[PDB]
Write a protein that binds this DNA or RNA. Structure first.
Ligand SMILES: [Mg+2]
Lengths: 444, 237
RNA sequence: UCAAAGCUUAGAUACCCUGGA
DNA sequence: CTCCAGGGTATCTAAGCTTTGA
């Protein structure tokens, strides 16, 4: 009723780890083991550098992740050793298969990496090169290996040199390691979907998600992808693949909605009881007509526009300076909402995702960021009386899946981020045959 | 109490009434509205007509001002329509947004004359007439011969037929050349990224210097239509 | 591009309108 | 009935910075 606000306790958007362990800190992957795992067979391919670079690759990918003698910290747990000891994965790598790739002309990088890339022995192919080369070959490589089993994990010379600080040596490894155990086929964690109940309390924890994002460049041309997400506490099925503006034409939007419906149906075929559609731009008229045409009254839907560039700022309490707790939600319902007419804007929910947070002391200690929080605006359109608190909780948990940022310090929606990445990658794919269904791990 | 930077109305923005004038040149009509925003005429150019509200009770005075300003831009025009149009802000968000911003510009201009007496050339408030909305520039710096300024930007939104004005702290660069330097960016981050106490006090000062108490802001759009908006200060659920 | 955040810049897009072809 | 160029206001995507994650 009216405009109100609250703070969501951090221990309500928990994530699930091995043995069905619920906790609100993704880094507790070091204590509860990954929700899923696959044997990792690294192929560390290095590009022209210097002896220090190779020594640093050996230090990172062998001494830390393999050698149990090297007692690495691995926070939140007293266990020491490699990945096979801390997480419970079959990590495999030897410091003699690292390939000394060299290039001397344009396009040599991709061909050389393809020749040095192996399928049967290795499923993860780390690539080590200077920023000049990665910045301009990374998207091309990702597109080239799309669909295939060779998932690359790039690394820059600066990141390796950072390992000598002994401060970065204690923070860069773990986030990278999770990526490894996610790009070999594993699932570091999933998101507890019980919060979905607070959405409506008239549907089970299951549902459907879809975030349309736009990649600008495409040689001065707007493009986009779709992204999909679903959770049942046991399945994830995160598949993400696919225009004179930041909107989906009517035809393309109808095709996208039908394709998402068919995808979910191929999963379990229960005629999705709920369709949540994130988007990084306002609901265009074309998309509104498409939603009415395909969904109509058959499916309950919630179209959430996630406005990052917003002017709203939130301070308060006048005592802890003017810093604001991380999970703060300002809800404003809209009385002028959908008299069965076609005015679908239900409410507006301003959520702060970056602020004060209490992470475990590792021995809870209050922590803050540098600057002022930039909350997100959740412009919600719905065909039913959705609960703004449930929408905020769902969005928070959506920010958290993210097997690239194991922390609670980020705000972007993961589905939208990977949809934008897929849109950028679409540039350099010339075969739309197996594209219709690829995994996020390809463009993780 | 989780105070914010948003000033929201309390009731639904009552039905707006605007007077229209027929203009045959929209391009110069935009400059006309920009100019007349200072004299108390808050208008927007749509459908070949300048729709505006005013705070001037003298019809002859308003007619003379508009006629002069229109002649200065070589525009063939017509007579005032005296409640030409009725506008619900929700149905026409841009009409209300532009009229409201022009009224806010007028209020800020009026206050400038009295909130600049005890000020220096590096602290005099101004309105930047550039590609943006309302921008109160109030701090100047010449860092490494790069001219930069800290000010408060204003934006307006209409949600559920209620006005919401957001004032925030923004820094801008008016150097014609390219930065191409790292020290300048280091300094710009040093002074443009602050804890939420320099920002909160900056916002409080900005609002207080133009509306006395900063718990509320009153913006007059017409002799009888005033937007009386209050800062949220929401406690909890 | 190990990741993120909060800044500033450039351009572009959306909503309404105007002109021309 | 269809684009391109313009205007005002508000966002969005992409680049360059700094800091942060013990
Ligand atoms: Mg990657």
């Amino acid at each position: 009723m009216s405009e109100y606000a609250t703070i969501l306790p951090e221990n309500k958007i928990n994530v699930i780890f091995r043995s069905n362990n619920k906790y609100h800190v993704p880094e507790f992957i070091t204590v509860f083991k990954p929700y899923e795992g696959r044997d990792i067979n690294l192929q560390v391919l290095v590009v022209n550098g210097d002896n220090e670079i190779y020594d640093l690759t050996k230090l990172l990918f062998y001494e830390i992740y393999v050698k149990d003698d090297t007692k690495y910290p691995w926070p939140y747990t007293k266990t020491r050793g490699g990945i096979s000891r801390v997480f419970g994965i079959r990590y495999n790598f030897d410091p003699s298969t690292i390939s000394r790739i060299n290039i001397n002309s344009e396009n040599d990088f991709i061909s050389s990496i393809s020749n040095q890339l192996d399928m049967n022995r290795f499923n993860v192919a780390v690539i080590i090169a200077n920023r000049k080369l990665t910045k301009e070959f990374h998207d091309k490589t990702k597109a080239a290996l799309i669909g295939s089993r060779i998932r690359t994990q790039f690394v820059t010379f600066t990141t390796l040199k950072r390992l000598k600080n002994r401060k970065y040596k204690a923070t860069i490894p773990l986030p990278l390691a999770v990526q490894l155990i996610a790009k070999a086929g594993g699932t570091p964690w999933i998101v507890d979907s019980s919060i979905y109940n607070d959405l409506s309390k008239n549907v089970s924890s299951n549902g459907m998600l879809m975030g349309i994002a736009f990649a600008r460049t495409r040689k001065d041309k707007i493009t986009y992808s779709v992204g999909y997400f679903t959770t049942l506490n046991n399945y994830y099925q995160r598949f993400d693949v696919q225009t004179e503006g930041l909107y989906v034409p009517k035809e393309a939007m109808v095709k996208t909605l039908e394709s998402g419906i068919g995808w979910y149906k191929n999963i379990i075929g229960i005629t999705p009881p709920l369709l949540i559609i994130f988007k990084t731009s306002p609901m265009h008229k074309d998309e509104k007509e498409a939603i009415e045409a395909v969904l109509g009254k058959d499916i309950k839907w919630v179209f959430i526009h996630a406005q990052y560039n917003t002017p709203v700022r939130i301070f308060g309490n006048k005592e802890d300076d003017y810093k604001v707790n991380r999970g703060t939600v300002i809800i404003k319902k809209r009385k002028r909402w959908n008299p069965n007419n076609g005015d679908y804007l239900h409410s507006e929910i301003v959520i702060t995702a970056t602020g004060k947070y209490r992470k475990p002391s590792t021995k809870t200690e209050e922590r803050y960021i540098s600057g002022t929080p930039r909350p997100i605006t959740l412009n919600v359109y719905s065909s039913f009386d959705v609960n703004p608190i449930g929408v905020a909780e769902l969005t928070l948990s959506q920010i958290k899946a993210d097997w690239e940022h194991p922390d609670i310090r980020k705000r972007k929606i993961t589905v939208l981020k990977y949809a934008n990445r897929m849109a950028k990658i679409i540039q350099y794919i010339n075969n739309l045959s197996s594209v219709p269904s690829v995994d996020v791990r390809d463009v993780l | 109490v989780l105070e914010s930077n948003m000033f929201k109305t309390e009731q639904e923005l009552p039905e707006l009434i605007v007077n229209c004038i027929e203009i045959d040149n929209e391009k110069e009509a935009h400059k006309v509205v920009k100019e007349i925003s200072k004299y108390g005429i808050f208008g927007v150019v749509r459908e070949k007509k300048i729709f505006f509200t005013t705070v001037i009770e003298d019809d002859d005075f308003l007619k003379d001002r508009l006629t002069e300003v229109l002649k200065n831009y070589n525009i063939n025009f017509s007579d005032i329509k005296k409640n030409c149009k009725k506008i619900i802000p929700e149905d026409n968000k841009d009409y209300f947004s532009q009229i409201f911003l022009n009224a806010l510009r007028y209020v800020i201009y009026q206050k400038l004359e009295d909130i600049n007496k005890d000020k220096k050339e590096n602290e005099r408030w101004t309105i930047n007439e550039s590609e943006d909305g309302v921008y109160i520039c109030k701090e100047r710096y010449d860092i490494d011969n790069y001219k930069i300024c800290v000010g408060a930007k204003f934006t307006i939104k209409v949600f559920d037929n209620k006005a919401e004005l957001y004032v925030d702290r923004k820094l801008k660069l008016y150097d014609e050349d390219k930065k191409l330097t790292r020290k300048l960016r280091g300094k710009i981050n040093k002074m443009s990224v602050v804890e939420p106490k320099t920002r909160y006090e900056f916002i409080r000062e900005i609002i207080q210097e133009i509306s006395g108490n900063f718990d509320y802001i009153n913006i007059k759009l017409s002799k009888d239509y005033t937007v009386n908006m209050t800062r949220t200060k929401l406690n909890e659920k």
